[PDB]
Amino acid sequence: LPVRLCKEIELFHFDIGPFENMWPGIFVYMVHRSCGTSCFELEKLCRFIMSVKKNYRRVPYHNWKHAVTVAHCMYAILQNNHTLFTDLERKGLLIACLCHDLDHRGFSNSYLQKFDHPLAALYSTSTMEQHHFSQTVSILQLEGHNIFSTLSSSEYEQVLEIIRKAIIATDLALYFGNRKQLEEMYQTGSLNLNNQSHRDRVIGLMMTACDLCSVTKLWPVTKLTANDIYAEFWAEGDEMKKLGIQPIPMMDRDKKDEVPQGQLGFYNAVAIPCYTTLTQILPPTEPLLKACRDNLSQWEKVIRG
Amino acid sequence: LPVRLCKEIELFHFDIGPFENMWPGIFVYMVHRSCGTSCFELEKLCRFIMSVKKNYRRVPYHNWKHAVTVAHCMYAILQNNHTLFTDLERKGLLIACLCHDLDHRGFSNSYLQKFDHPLAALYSTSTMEQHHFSQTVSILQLEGHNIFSTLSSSEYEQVLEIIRKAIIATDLALYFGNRKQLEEMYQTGSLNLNNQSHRDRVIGLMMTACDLCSVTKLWPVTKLTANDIYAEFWAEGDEMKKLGIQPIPMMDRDKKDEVPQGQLGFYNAVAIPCYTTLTQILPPTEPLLKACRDNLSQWEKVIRG
Numbered sequence A, B: 001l002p003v004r005l006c007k008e009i010e011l012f013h014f015d016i017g018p019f020e021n022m023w024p025g026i027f028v029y030m031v032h033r034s035c036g037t038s039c040f041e042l043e044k045l046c047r048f049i050m051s052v053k054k055n056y057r058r059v060p061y062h063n064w065k066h067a068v069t070v071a072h073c074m075y076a077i078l079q080n081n082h083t084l085f086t087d088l089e090r091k092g093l094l095i096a097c098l099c100h101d102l103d104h105r106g107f108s109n110s111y112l113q114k115f116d117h118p119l120a121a122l123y124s125t126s127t128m129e130q131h132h133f134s135q136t137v138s139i140l141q142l143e144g145h146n147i148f149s150t151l152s153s154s155e156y157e158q159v160l161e162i163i164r165k166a167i168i169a170t171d172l173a174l175y176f177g178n179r180k181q182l183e184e185m186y187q188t189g190s191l192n193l194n195n196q197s198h199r200d201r202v203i204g205l206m207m208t209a210c211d212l213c214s215v216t217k218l219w220p221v222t223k224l225t226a227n228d229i230y231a232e233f234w235a236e237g238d239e240m241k242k243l244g245i246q247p248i249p250m251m252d253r254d255k256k257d258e259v260p261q262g263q264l265g266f267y268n269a270v271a272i273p274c275y276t277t278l279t280q281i282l283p284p285t286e287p288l289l290k291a292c293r294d295n296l297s298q299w300e301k302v303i304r305g
């Protein structure tokens, strides 16, 4: 509600700030403008949000701050393509984003598999993501926490299906296949948002874009956020070493100095193609791609000196 | 088919040229590229196109050339917003544009009513437009002309209803209310393409935009097309005078030198608002609004001398 936030929350590169106790208010604000005032009962929406907060952990990157950050990117996409999405899709995608990393420990799917963690035996594919969806369902089942109580059953199942597909798509491993399919479909003209499978893929791509949105922030934010990502990655690399396994340089603390190149390779191979394809499908998402290109060239500048 | 045409047909301000016998080929190129090669049985489409041509009259403006010119603007809107349209809209809209002035006599609805022409008794409202649709149905029902023969009964009924509304929407009297409603729906965030009635309204505006597209061409095309518009209009004013009715200045050749002011009034009151509102709803249509603004200046230049 403060004047500066009302204005700057509409910008794609908004940063939600260091005051944790304001992020919940920021979130309800976004869903009030996106969905409307009558979409959720306020008391139980707030109860739901605080439970979701309580179930994110104190890890350097995959934390409560990141959840609210991803939800804001989704908000900025919803508000600049306000004409495309249904009542349920708007409700569902903000909530999905807010819950998409629920109960993350700071470890990748491959570390869970190599450790032989219980979750890996339960979910052979997209381990952490299936857990994220499972957590969000458990939180919905808590007394007083079903923010979708007012929906019909038919509509309730639709929004839970919107949420699971969305959360599963944040598995970056599914992104490469998804982006590639959408590229061929956009170029040939077969792409069609009235086709549910096509729509599901666009939403999948949107989730990636939001998930990766630290690369679309202004340089100082992107740069500082990078410390948090690597602190988490290196901790995992340490744990690989403890299992007797040489981790990839990405996660290896001893290769700090190759970070500038490593990021460069990631922007070219993952980030630019993601927002390039997204901007093609939804042209109003242009500023995300613009800001991505700016950070790419900032990383190029770190290589030189 | 030829190299220059293939490139420049993607531009909003493309002129289809003076060679009548290429226009049908230009139209099939357009449906093949925006719908697909499998949408229509080629032999049936060519028969349909030719007998549609046969039922346009040798009149100064509302002729075959204007039918294909309007289909082209629609094609250009489809290709820059392609992801939004149903398979049925991809088939029906180019047809609707091709057929939207079928059997135009060169006279307004007002003249037909004042003359007491039989059409005025048959269709009290949107007279010529109801006739245009009636004509396109008669042509669809000629042996070998049902280009929609492989559709289901359900699919046939609803593509004809798409065409009906699109053609009816070309009555410029209905545009004012339609645009005013869409403006409020856009401003308040109420507008939504998952609502069928909203979808109809937007298509109606696209229809208005395509029908008026001579204002969105480059100056020399727009200037010369104005000669043809006024040749029809002045012929109607002659005929009004013969009924003992003083015609409005717009259709009075004795008011020739007020044309620039009349054009300027039209751009400010009708054309700019149309493309402005269309660009809000469909941002990739911006080149139309841009060309309209450029022509707005050209008419202001003419006023000055």
Ligand SMILES: O=C(c1ccc(Oc2ncccc2C2CCOCC2)cc1)c1nc2ccccc2[nH]1
Pocket: A172, A212, A214, A215, A229, A233, A249, A250, A251, A255, A256, A257, A258, A259, A260, A261, A262, A263, A265, A266
């Ligand atoms: O590609 C790298 C990379 C590393 C981290 C990374 O995470 C992100 N970076 C920026 C924005 C978003 C991310 C997310 C973090 C969470 O999981 C998905 C990626 C990306 C590439 C990378 N390769 C390296 C080789 C040697 C030394 C360092 C290297 N870094």
Ligand SMILES: O=C(c1ccc(Oc2ncccc2C2CCOCC2)cc1)c1nc2ccccc2[nH]1
Pocket: B172, B212, B214, B215, B229, B233, B249, B250, B251, B255, B256, B258, B259, B260, B261, B262, B263, B265, B266
């Ligand atoms: O507003 C006029 C006007 C006239 C023609 C007109 O037709 C179009 N002009 C440009 C683009 C498209 C059109 C279409 C033609 C078919 O019917 C819809 C308009 C528009 C305004 C107009 N008012 C006048 C007063 C005195 C003398 C001349 C005047 N002209």
Ligand SMILES: [Zn+2]
Pocket: A100, A101, A170, A171
């Ligand atoms: Zn995740």
Ligand SMILES: [Zn+2]
Pocket: A066, A070, A100, A101, A170, A211
């Ligand atoms: Zn995430």
Ligand SMILES: [Zn+2]
Pocket: B100, B101, B128, B170, B171
């Ligand atoms: Zn007409």
Ligand SMILES: [Zn+2]
Pocket: B066, B070, B100, B101, B170, B211
């Ligand atoms: Zn017309």
